[PDB]
């Protein structure tokens, strides 16, 4: 069974890394039920380009009948070693339709048809709580992030965030601090160094039983489109979504909307004694969200301790 998916893995890397096929091109290929293995084993360039869904080239073209066999065989041979190269770094490619693929992602209209993974894949199949927010939080947003995640200590939950500046990085840092496994869904390929000084955090995430996850091909750069596209994954994986600090018509609003479309539970942190803002009121109105008081405790619980 292993060898079937490894052949599809190598075909994906062949088209992506060697021939440079776009994410979108390969996505709609897989969306149609076309397997990359049968694209790379095409015996003509016409067949190649038909299955790949691009505009067929006329003559003259540098790819032709005279050099097709080597073009095909050399790319298959190249990609087979390239996958062992990525396996050696601890990366796994999880394909849609395989046993390792998590059910939750098939709630999406556009499920990822492949995933690059580094770390503990079994977390995708277990309870997850998304913690996400602005890349430019206030001091209180940073605290609420940690306070929220501390509530899940010794639960069966892991955390999910996007490894981005601000709330997301504070979410991962908090999960690590409290020894909650955390999942980072990237807006890049696995090879990128974004965000700054990310290689150590990714290391600690993996060392603490966490997971690095991305739908994007190894060398895909960060982009505003890549982030919004990735947030459908974050919403789908989040059994509960907790947007800590966020404005409407923001990145995180997309995630919250998606979570509402996916009928995920939505909790909104509110510090004791403070007034909900319209983004919170929006979530209670639209998405049937729920306030989560921080602290959840009352001061009466503190009084019990002081005066025994």
The stretch near a copy of itself (CB under 8 A) out of 64-72, 211-219, 230-238, 288-296 is: 288-296
Contacting residues for 139 by C-beta, under 8 A, at least 6 apart: none
Candidates 1, 2, 88, 139: give the one binding a copy of itself (CB under 8 A). Answer: 139
Residue 284 as a binder of a copy of itself (CB under 8 A): the answer is no
Q: Which is nearer to a copy of itself, 71 or 143 (CB)?
A: 143
The rounded Cα 113 to chain-centroid distance in angstroms is: 12
Residue 159 as a binder of a copy of itself (CB under 8 A): the answer is no
- List alpha helices for the chain, DSSP H: 2-13, 23-31, 36-40, 45-52, 68-88, 139-150, 167-177, 199-207, 224-237, 251-261, 278-285, 299-306
Q: Which is nearer to a copy of itself, 54 or 271 (CB)?
A: 271
Residue 93's H or E segment, with its range, is strand 91-95
Candidates 271, 278, 285, 286: give the one binding a copy of itself (CB under 8 A). Answer: 271
| CA neighbor of 244 nearest in space, from 191, 163, 173, 168 | 168
Q: Which is nearer to a copy of itself, 34 or 140 (CB)?
A: 140
Mark residues 46-85: x for contact with a copy of itself by CB under 8 A, - for none: ----------------------------------------
Q: Are strands 211-214 and 114-119 parallel, antiparallel or unpaired?
A: antiparallel
Residue 263 as a binder of a copy of itself (CB under 8 A): the answer is no
CA distance 23 to 25: 6
The site partner of 71 among Cl ion, a copy of itself, none (C-beta below 5 to 8 Å per kind) is none
User: Shortest distance, CB of residue 94 to a copy of itself, whole angstroms?
Assistant: 27
Candidates 30, 117, 160, 268: give the one binding Cl ion (CB under 5 A). Answer: 30
The answer to whether residues 223 and 229 touch, using CB atoms and an 8 Å cutoff, is no
Q: What are phi and psi of 274, to 5 degrees?
A: -110, 160
Residues at the contact surface with Cl ion, assessed by CB under 5 A: 30
| Binding residues for a copy of itself (CB under 8 A) | 139-140, 143, 146-147, 150-155, 174, 177-178, 240, 265, 267, 271-273, 290, 292, 294-297, 299, 301-302, 305-308
């Amino acid at each position: 069974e292993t060898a079937r998916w490894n052949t599809e893995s190598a075909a994906l890397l062949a088209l992506s890394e060697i021939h440079g096929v776009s994410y979108w091109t390969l996505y709609k290929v897989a969306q149609k039920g076309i397997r990359f293995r049968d694209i790379v084993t095409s015996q003509t360039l016409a067949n190649f380009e038909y299955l790949l869904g691009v505009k067929l080239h006329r003559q003259p073209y540098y790819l032709n009948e005279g050099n097709w066999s080597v073009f095909r065989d050399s790319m298959i041979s190249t990609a087979k070693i390239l996958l062992t190269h990525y396996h050696n770094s601890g990366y796994k490619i999880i394909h849609h339709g395989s046993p390792s693929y998590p059910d939750k992602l098939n709630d999406l209209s556009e499920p990822p048809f492949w995933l690059f993974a580094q770390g503990n894949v079994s977390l995708l199949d277990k309870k997850c709580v998304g913690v996400v927010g602005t890349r430019n939080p206030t001091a209180l947003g940073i605290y609420l992030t940690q306070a929220v995640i501390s509530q899940f200590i010794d639960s069966d939950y892991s955390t999910v965030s996007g490894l981005a500046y601000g709330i997301d990085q504070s979410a991962h840092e908090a999960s690590l601090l409290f020894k909650i496994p955390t999942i980072a869904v990237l807006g890049t390929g696995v090879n990128s160094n974004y965000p700054k000084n990310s290689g150590e955090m990714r290391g600690h995430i993996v060392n603490n039983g966490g997971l690095i996850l991305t739908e994007y091909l190894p060398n895909q750069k960060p982009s505003q489109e890549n982030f919004v596209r990735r947030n459908r994954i974050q919403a789908a994986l989040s059994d509960v979504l907790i947007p800590v600090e966020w404005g409407l018509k923001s990145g995180t609003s997309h995630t919250v909307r998606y979570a509402a479309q996916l009928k995920r539970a939505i909790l909104c942190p509110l510090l004791r004694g403070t007034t909900p803002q319209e983004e919170i009121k929006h979530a209670l109105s639209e998405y049937s969200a729920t306030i989560m008081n921080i602290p959840l405790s009352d001061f009466k619980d503190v009084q019990s301790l002081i005066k025994s």
